[PDB]
């Protein structure tokens, strides 16, 4: 009579999967992902750091762009994550197999990564990806140093329990540039109020808005570039319209408050 | 220009996903999966055992058929696996979350289950599923006893390194029935000779043919029923045409030898 | 010349290892550990819950006391933890092997449990125990229900990142009794200020004092009974001198402030 | 009355813990462990390989000897294991935290490593150590190549299910030297016959004797040097009395047959 449905892969907008050549953000920091998914390469004299990798099928493209930058597989030392959803941590397992890279993440992100995004608090098994293990667990405010670039973790739970902003100082034109890679603050299709799987969701989002507002932030980047008004396809003006961290937090909070009101009405 | 491809879910023949009501094999043993994927429920006075669950989307159907048999979620004590591919272990993680069940498997199956079938020796990441942890590691020839039914593991590596046959004795018409749930012996699209990820593949398959030939085997069942000539949709004659274990092993070896010859020619 | 030192097991006060018979706390709640380590059995019509198990060598004693209470290994459904140090989660792995029990814990506790307490933020590898996997990850404020007893998690990070208080309502003399199993608030030998492995340690402890002060709390119990002024060897007056949650929090904060001052002076 | 016993660390002969300076075996291969535990450093132009690390407390000594050889923590690329007992894999977790090293092991060794040697088939929880994750699972006969040195795995189950011999070709005096690092073939205190946790133990040991006898083997090394008649404290004559692989296998089989006969008589 009626068979059970076939499994459905989550399909994304084509721009999320559109390869781009490396785009320089600061002296050591490059966008090497796709037009609409951030994957940041930070290059140091002592090896490279990758912050996010995008979707699972982006692994080979990332390695190609690393090679274009002078980074061989052995040179990739560290993978950091904004959060462990399939569209940001998708290729981590494959990257670990193909490079020297080790993963550092907080406990919440580590457990979600280790189950490949399955049993998501909001999406169930709808967006799974290959599981990976974290090599180092980080705590809030902990620093990790690679070739003299210091990365600081700032927990900003909400979009996932383990959502993290990463900050570091690079240079540009001889002057320091405080880069803030702030995580998503969206809640796409989430039940916000009275969620049995995330009872303090609203409190965590409100704290996370405050955390983002206060980040050291000359340049804001986000996992989805549109969230911070980056346009990676716009070349020399890709970052011209980027939001401040304050503006990003304010916009996210206004959207969140609207969603809460609609949820109450729905 | 050209975006990377969207992820593709592996889609299966519709009969693999066609629910069926429980079909009794022996006094305590029932097929509760789909028309073309085996999932065996063994019911004892001390709880139930599930051998395989089929595809990931079959979890709720399995629980429905268990309930029809008098088995509540708390009553499911043990999940055993033939091998940890998505079409047999697919729903294990969800079943563990929704029942009291613990998983027993050999080390090879446990590591493949824990990575959700990713980095498959032959399929890469093409057939992933939600990862799950094994609660007990079993060795070759080890027995597990549930409510007085004794299950014996017989390793038969090849289709996966961890492929296992499970045997137990049930009853029918007052007489013992030695049931052999023998794993797949297919090698679908595999590189058999000189495979760097499985150097002794051919030797393992040949040993596994010999293991299957020698199993205690009044009734053979297989994860794909067609492999042992079962027809789960045929009601009272579902098992009438079933192969012996000897015939199953011989047929698998003849097919394997043909594949080897074609590989040499290709 | 001089060999490396032998490994040293952490040895504890003998009272921590002194078995005791079950001591009833409320209609369904029993202390079944040792004189100086709490292990709480909550018995319901639908199976039993264990909160903490004490030291690794306590597994058989716990099972003996469960049997004395009418709880067989199959009847133990759930293990909850205060925190995943060796003196409270020590026997969890063995209990999972020997019972039907599944573990529910927050992500921080799950990752520490899965590494058997190794690489502790403060103790390094000095207090390891057999690793175990969590079956369910809980979020702050999440409830788990067993046979109609509702357990609520209240995160109180500090002693470990994953430290949790568990609350439930039992009965006594026909009246509700709100039981609070609050975790340790000690910091034994910890570097409190400027700790690179726990940068927000002090902030987390201060929040945890406030959490404990506000718990629903007719009866306070603690992993080390002396912390809440229980005397499990005192029979019918074991709980007579027990602190309120408010008094426990106040005492812990005063001790913490003294330790901070001594650290500044040392 | 009588408290439960304190945990007992397994204490080893002092020579197992006696540090030694690096002892050269061949052009790229050095013993860097203790007088009575092997830990082999293989140095290549593309990074270093460590085969075994000895006991848990040896991590810092290993890193000191690596530094003496010109190998920094970032230069250690790969850890291979003979088997995952505490006296050979003890420091692996710490080495992974402190170096760039990734672990490659077979599935049996990986699962035992991941539980820190707990629930050992023969020793129970008597010899635990800090758990570690494997980064790569290897199959029998699989090769791993580092800086042009090719390591081949030869499974030799028995002492543990995952016991592995590793072979590679180095040079000495301009000529190839086929090095065989063969695992332990002892069965210390094991129940050999009818062991429910290892039903095919005897068959596996007999196959492993045959595997060892046939290894490519100009120079045999073993995890316990005395098993192959090495004397690491004897300087320029440390390896003079070393057994062939054939002689090692024959001696192990004669000892095994004697143990079997004593077990039958006991
Ligand atoms: C679960 C995954 C597959 C998923 C699916 C679908 C959407 C998202 C978003 C998301 C939501 C809103 C905006 C608009 S905006 C100006 O940024 O508010 C953006 Cl750009 C992205 C995110 C995310 O935020 O990570 N994830 C999604
Ligand atoms: C990786 C998964 C998704 C997959 C995909 C596609 C096919 C299979 C088979 C398979 C092969 C041959 C036969 C014909 S026959 C009379 O049995 O020789 C049968 Cl029925 C099944 C198997 C398996 O054997 O498990 N798995 C497959
Ligand atoms: C790491 C483990 C093995 C360990 C070792 C040693 C001590 C503890 C304590 C601890 C500290 C203070 C008090 C005095 S008091 C009135 O309670 O402030 C108490 Cl009772 C217990 C704890 C703990 O609190 O869990 N753990 C310890
Ligand atoms: C479980 C651990 C802590 C343990 C404890 C105690 C002994 C061993 C041995 C062992 C056995 C026999 C020989 C004598 S001989 C000439 O080699 O036959 C040797 Cl040297 C070593 C081994 C091992 O073989 O790995 N492990 C032991
Ligand atoms: Zn997301
Ligand atoms: Zn996203
Ligand atoms: Zn298969
Ligand atoms: Zn199949
Ligand atoms: Zn503690
Ligand atoms: Zn304690
Ligand atoms: Zn050993
Ligand atoms: Zn040994």
């Amino acid at each position: 009579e009626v068979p059970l449905p076939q499994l459905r892969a989550y399909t994304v907008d084509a721009s999320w999967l559109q390869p781009m050549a490396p785009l320089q953000i600061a002296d050591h920091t490059w966008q090497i992902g796709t037009e609409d998914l951030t994957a940041l390469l930070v290059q140091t004299p002592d090896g490279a750091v990758l912050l996010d990798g995008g979707m699972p099928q982006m692994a080979s493209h990332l390695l190609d762009n690393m090679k274009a930058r002078g980074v061989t597989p052995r040179d990739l030392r560290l993978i950091l994550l904004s959060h462990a959803h399939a569209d940001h941590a998708g290729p981590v397992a494959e990257l670990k197999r193909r490079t020297g890279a080790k993963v550092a993440a907080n406990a919440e992100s580590a457990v979600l990564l280790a189950r490949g995004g399955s049993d998501d608090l909001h999406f169930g098994d709808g967006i799974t990806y290959p599981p990976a293990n974290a090599d180092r667990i980080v705590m809030d405010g902990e620093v990790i140093t690679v070739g003299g670039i210091v990365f600081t973790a700032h927990f900003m739970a909400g979009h996932t329990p383990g959502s993290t902003a990463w900050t570091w100082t690079d240079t540009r034109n001889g002057k320091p540039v405080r880069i803030a890679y702030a995580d998503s603050l969206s809640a796409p299709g989430y039940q916000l109020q009275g969620n049995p799987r995330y009872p303090h969701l609203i409190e965590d989002y409100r704290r996370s808005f405050a955390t983002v507002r206060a980040l050291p932030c000359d340049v804001l980047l986000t996992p989805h570039p549109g969230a911070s008004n980056w346009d990676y396809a716009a070349g020399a003006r890709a970052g011209a319209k980027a939001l401040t961290c304050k503006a990003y937090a304010d916009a996210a909070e206004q959207k969140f408050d609207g969603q809460l009101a609609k949820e109450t009405a729905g």
Side-chain angles (χ1 to χ4, degrees), chain A residues 101-222:
Chain A
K102 291 183 169 187
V103 169
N106 61 26
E108 286 284 7
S109 290
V111 303
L112 184 60
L113 185 69
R115 65 184 193 250
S118 66
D119 190 27
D120 187 87
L121 301 190
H122 307 284
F123 300 130
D125 291 335
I127 49 158
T128 61
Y129 59 95
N133 291 315
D135 299 279
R136 176 175 176 175
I137 301 293
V138 293
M139 292 289 286
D140 197 5
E142 185 166 0
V143 309
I144 302 181
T145 303
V146 178
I149 303 201
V150 181
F151 300 86
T152 300
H154 310 251
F155 292 4
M156 47 176 288
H159 180 85
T160 65
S163 285
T164 302
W166 286 101
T167 62
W168 60 106
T169 303
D170 203 341
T171 54
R172 186 154 209 70
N173 304 326
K175 291 309 224 241
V177 180
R178 298 168 291 173
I179 298 176
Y181 188 43
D183 198 13
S184 303
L185 286 168
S186 64
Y190 294 10
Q191 178 186 330
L192 306 180
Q193 306 175 63
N195 190 319
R197 293 290 298 276
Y198 199 161
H200 297 329
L201 185 152
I202 292 164
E203 173 180 22
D204 278 0
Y205 270 88
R206 297 224 180 269
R207 191 182 314 99
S208 293
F209 304 143
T211 292
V212 169
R213 179 176 157 82
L215 293 170
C217 184
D218 295 318
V219 178
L220 170 66
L221 298 138
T222 50

Side-chain angles (χ1 to χ4, degrees), chain A residues 47-137:
Chain A
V49 182
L50 179 70
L51 300 95
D52 284 356
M55 290 277 286
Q57 59 269 59
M58 286 171 48
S60 286
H61 165 69
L62 293 172
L63 293 169
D64 290 336
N65 270 352
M66 287 172 196
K67 188 180 160 172
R69 291 267 74 247
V71 177
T72 68
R74 297 193 48 217
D75 290 332
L76 185 69
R77 280 186 57 190
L78 176 64
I79 293 167
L80 302 175
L81 299 169
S82 59
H83 69 273
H85 277 161
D87 54 324
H88 308 290
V92 167
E94 177 171 356
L95 288 168
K96 291 191 75 187
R97 295 196 305 272
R98 297 177 65 182
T99 73
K102 291 183 169 187
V103 169
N106 61 26
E108 286 284 7
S109 290
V111 303
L112 184 60
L113 185 69
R115 65 184 193 250
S118 66
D119 190 27
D120 187 87
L121 301 190
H122 307 284
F123 300 130
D125 291 335
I127 49 158
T128 61
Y129 59 95
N133 291 315
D135 299 279
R136 176 175 176 175
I137 301 293

Side-chain angles (χ1 to χ4, degrees), chain A residues 8 37 122:
Chain A
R8 290 182 183 176
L37 289 172
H122 307 284

